[PDB]
């Protein structure tokens, strides 16, 4: 029996990247052919596994992480990357055994005048350790003066909103992302 990937791939709403979403799928068959030819993916890259040989993988669970970022940020969903998304929202380790699929979703995830559902973390103290989820909304202190939960100079709310319009260049348009993580 083949893996139930549509529930994650075809789901109507996707998580914001900072609060990325996690499905455990187990005891099934991951087949590269069926998966790749199911849609028009703009990125599909596997790490530590041979694409041809997904059927031959021997795993208890596959972990399906999904979320939305912008096109220019898709580069960062990969082992050993750096930047906003890879540092403060979603971090892949270097011993990464899985795949990373993505596709332009301007048609689902963009309204004229703006969709603001999708947020990203912009400031954090330490960098994210792989597969760690930070959904805290603590005011980020950039200076010596403490913030006391209030927002202002050197005291920034740590999440901002993509403003997803259809008008944007392809780099700033939304992309849906699924990360298969086998174990």
């Amino acid at each position: 029996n083949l893996c139930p990937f549509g529930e994650v791939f075809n789901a109507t709403r996707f998580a914001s990247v900072y609060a990325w979403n996690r499905k455990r799928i187990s005891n099934c068959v991951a087949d590269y052919s069926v998966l790749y030819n199911s849609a028009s993916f703009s990125t599909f890259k596997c790490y530590g596994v041979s694409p041809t040989k997904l059927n031959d993988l021997c795993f208890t669970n596959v972990y399906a992480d999904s979320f939305v970022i912008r096109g220019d940020e898709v580069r960062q969903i990969a082992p050993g990357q750096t930047g906003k998304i890879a540092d403060y929202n979603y971090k892949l380790p270097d011993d990464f055994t899985g795949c990373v699929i993505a596709w332009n979703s301007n048609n689902l995830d963009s309204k004229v005048g703006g969709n603001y559902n999708y947020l990203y973390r912009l400031f954090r103290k330490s960098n994210l350790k792989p597969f760690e989820r930070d959904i805290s909304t603590e005011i980020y202190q950039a200076g010596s003066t403490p913030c006391n939960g209030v927002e202002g100079f050197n005291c920034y709310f740590p999440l901002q909103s993509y403003g997803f319009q259809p008008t944007n260049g392809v780099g700033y348009q939304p992309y849906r992302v699924v990360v298969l993580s086998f174990e």
């Epitope: 103290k125 202190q141 950039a142 200076g143 010596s144 003066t145 403490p146 100079f153 050197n154």
Partner: single-chain antibody, 228 residues
């Protein structure tokens, strides 16, 4: 090494404008906030405002808003401050200083300073205002804050004719390289600076500072004379 290098001295008629610069080197410029501190001739140190070079956001002291404008040029790693419509009250020395957060609180590096010559706030009180000691005495200087400031108090030392240099941040921690004879103390509203075996080179004026909220404020200064 960190270095803050300010533009040279300026002479301006009443009414003119002056844009004094502060060229940084030694560190990631966009990751440290920049403040401007005024020292009117024989007066308290005064925090004028600050700019965050990552975003270009500013906070000004109400006394200096609309007199002063703070900008940066990331491409030149340079902070700028423009004083408009100069009056004679504006003849002073202007310092740029770096917020050392989060490794060392408060202003951990100052510029040489630029002399410009024209022709509910948290109160900080120091005692004594003036002091005379002999090599080897301990000296004690206290600072009373008009409101609670936890341990967000720093002390600076201003040797004669130079910029302030940090000694203590966070009430009791020493800046990098500061001599161990300086120790700071206290909490809440009462702070003390102690110099333990005073050396001739300690001839300086010493200032406390709170950074518990904006605007930052300084004490009036404590002159320390060393008899030989």
């Amino acid at each position: 090494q960190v270095q803050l290098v300010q533009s040279g001295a300026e002479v301006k008629k009443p009414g003119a404008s002056v844009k004094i610069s502060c060229k940084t080197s030694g560190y990631t410029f966009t990751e440290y906030t920049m403040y401007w501190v005024r020292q009117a001739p024989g007066q308290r140190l005064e925090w004028m405002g600050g700019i965050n070079p990552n975003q270009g956001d500013t906070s000004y002291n109400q006394k200096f808003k609309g007199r002063a404008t703070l900008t940066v040029d990331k491409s030149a790693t340079t902070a700028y401050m423009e004083l408009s419509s100069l009056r004679s009250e504006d003849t002073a020395v202007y310092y740029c200083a770096r917020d050392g957060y989060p490794y060392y609180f408060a202003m951990d590096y100052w510029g040489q300073g630029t002399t410009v010559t024209v022709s509910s706030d948290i109160q900080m009180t120091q005692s004594p205002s003036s002091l005379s000691a002999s090599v080897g005495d301990r000296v004690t200087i206290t600072c009373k804050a008009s409101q609670n400031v936890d341990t967000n108090v720093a002390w600076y030392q201003q040797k004669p004719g130079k910029a302030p240099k940090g000694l203590i941040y966070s009430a009791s921690s020493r800046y990098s390289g500061v001599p161990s004879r300086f120790s700071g103390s206290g909490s809440g509203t009462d702070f003390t600076l102690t110099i333990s075996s005073v050396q001739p080179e300690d001839l300086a004026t010493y200032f406390c500072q709170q950074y518990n909220t904006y605007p930052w404020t300084f004490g009036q200064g404590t002159k320390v004379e060393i008899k030989a």
